[PDB]
Design a protein around this nucleic acid. Sequence first.
DNA 1: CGCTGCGTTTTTTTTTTCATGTGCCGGTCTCACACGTGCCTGGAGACTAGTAAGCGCTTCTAGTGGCGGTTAAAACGCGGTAGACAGCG
DNA 2: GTATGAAAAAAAAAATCGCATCCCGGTGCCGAGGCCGCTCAATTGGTCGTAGACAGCTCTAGCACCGCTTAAACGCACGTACGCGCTGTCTACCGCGTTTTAACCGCCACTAGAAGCGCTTACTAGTCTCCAGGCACGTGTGAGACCGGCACATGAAAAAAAAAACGCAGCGGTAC
Lengths: 98, 98, 56, 80, 82
Amino acid sequence: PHRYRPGTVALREIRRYQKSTELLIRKLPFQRLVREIAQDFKTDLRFQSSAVMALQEACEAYLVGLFEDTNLCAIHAKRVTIMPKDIQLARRIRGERA
Amino acid sequence: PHRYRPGTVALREIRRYQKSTELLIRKLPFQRLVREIAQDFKTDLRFQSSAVMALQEACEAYLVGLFEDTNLCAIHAKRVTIMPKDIQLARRIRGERA
Amino acid sequence: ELAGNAARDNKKTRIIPRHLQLAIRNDEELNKLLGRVTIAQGGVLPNIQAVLLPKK
Amino acid sequence: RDNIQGITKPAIRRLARRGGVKRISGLIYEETRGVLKVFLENVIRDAVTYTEHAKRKTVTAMDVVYALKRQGRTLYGFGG
Amino acid sequence: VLRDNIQGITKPAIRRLARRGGVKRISGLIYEETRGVLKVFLENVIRDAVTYTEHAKRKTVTAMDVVYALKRQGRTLYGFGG
DNA sequence: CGCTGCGTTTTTTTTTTCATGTGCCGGTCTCACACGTGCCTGGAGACTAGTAAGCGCTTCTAGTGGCGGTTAAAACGCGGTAGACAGCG
DNA sequence: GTATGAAAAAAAAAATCGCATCCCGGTGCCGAGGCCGCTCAATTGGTCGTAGACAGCTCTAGCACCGCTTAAACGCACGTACGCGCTGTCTACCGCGTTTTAACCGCCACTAGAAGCGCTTACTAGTCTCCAGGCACGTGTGAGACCGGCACATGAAAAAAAAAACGCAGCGGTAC
Ligand SMILES: [Ca+2]
Ligand SMILES: [K+]
Ligand SMILES: [K+]
């Protein structure tokens, strides 16, 4: 057959997802996680559909913004791949960890 | 002849200045700057000596903060010298710039 | 409490800012709390990154 | 359960692609799962504090807005 | 009478800052880069400060103006009237 | 001519000095902490009074299941290529 | 005999090829846009009371000098270890095609809890008067820095001693 060279699907996967705004985590998975994490701080809580989507709209905004910073670090290391030691450097400079 | 190998004094110099707390910018210079910079906003100003000192404490603390963030970016690129690119990267992830 | 111990260690009777710095920065919680707080005449905790040390 | 794995590899990759990430180490996926959990935990904590204080057993969008604003992650278009 | 004072933040002074930084090795280009970031930072804080001074019909910038300025800028200073 | 080893001359690596900045002890001088005293303002007392807020009851929303169906999306795995990491100058 | 000349291979730029993304309409459904009449929150108008504008007066503290002293900044010089680019190995992360799964729909029925409406109480703001806590003055004594003399662990040098290229010499082999 024919096949696209490692990367050129990615570059497209970028252009696609930058030009769009649909939320990229599956709605129900996320929501279960939210209630999982909420039981910690209080049992038999109830959420407004919107309040779940308010969280999901943030988490995604944040992670997106992180990866942006992450990617600039990986690139700073004359790399193209992102790795944990790039996230951690971002988050340290951001001031989330020590 | 007796000489210490490049980056040996440097390391001593660290231990020295990390153990101490005194302002490292000679005070008159710094003061002159502040007033030079105050002109840009209002002519024939005056400064409480404590104001001038409240700035120098602030600036010196900021810079020392940057160079720590800076220095982890240099190190991120398997380096040891700090380079403008490192500061640039640090301010970038901080939010001081785009 | 923590800063007062800072001043023992240092063999000093009066607390100076640096004892406050060493107190706050060395406690995880207090440091989260004073995250965006500069402490005049407080300096930095001694820290030197490993890669910068000589190998011998 | 353990719904954190419900944040599938391809979804994280999706976010990274919006982030403008070309290449993605296999480790990342679990790391991201960690950072995400911290973030949800922290927001949800303060959110549910805001709920409990109003005495409601239902968490509102406004709980979550107030939290995000505290947490320094202000949100537009759910009120407040 | 010395219209370019940014220079008075002398290479050695910046070296020392960088030392407290925990920096072993300093590119030459830095100093200027530093001087520049310094300038921005002072400029930013002192603007806000003088705003506060001016708002109080004073000709004299107070230590409190500088704190109110540092607090706004997200850069909070203890030990001058906090 | 070509090799081969073996004394030579140098290089690498070890051992011992050695000159350096360290932080360590114990006596002088300074101005900053601590006390104190006396004055003044801002907290306490107490009672008045007017209104916020908390609890129960009224309604009806909007949140929580749950039921299948189809499809788009994850899963998994194989195959190869380009990018991460070390090593050289 | 010798300068010579066309095969291999390498590298490269062009044309199938096919593959995924944008524009043309056509279909329909849903949500924005807009009116309806109802409710309270904005306005009107007047009075009572205080916040702050105002001009002085006070004294502070900020400016600016004098003129030594020294430390720090500056400015050269010599060399080393770090930055940086170039390569080439291997493996891990992308791309595409089976197989597995669970999300997203458009229904269901049920209940809590949200959210509103009332009535009642106890909880605050609001007077005033009255002490004492707390602050702006002036005093003094001691911690602590500062100075200079110490052994003291040190990394840098100096002094021996366990290896890797260099001569240079002995000698065997081999055609001739
Ligand atoms: Ca000394
Ligand atoms: K409800
Ligand atoms: K004054």
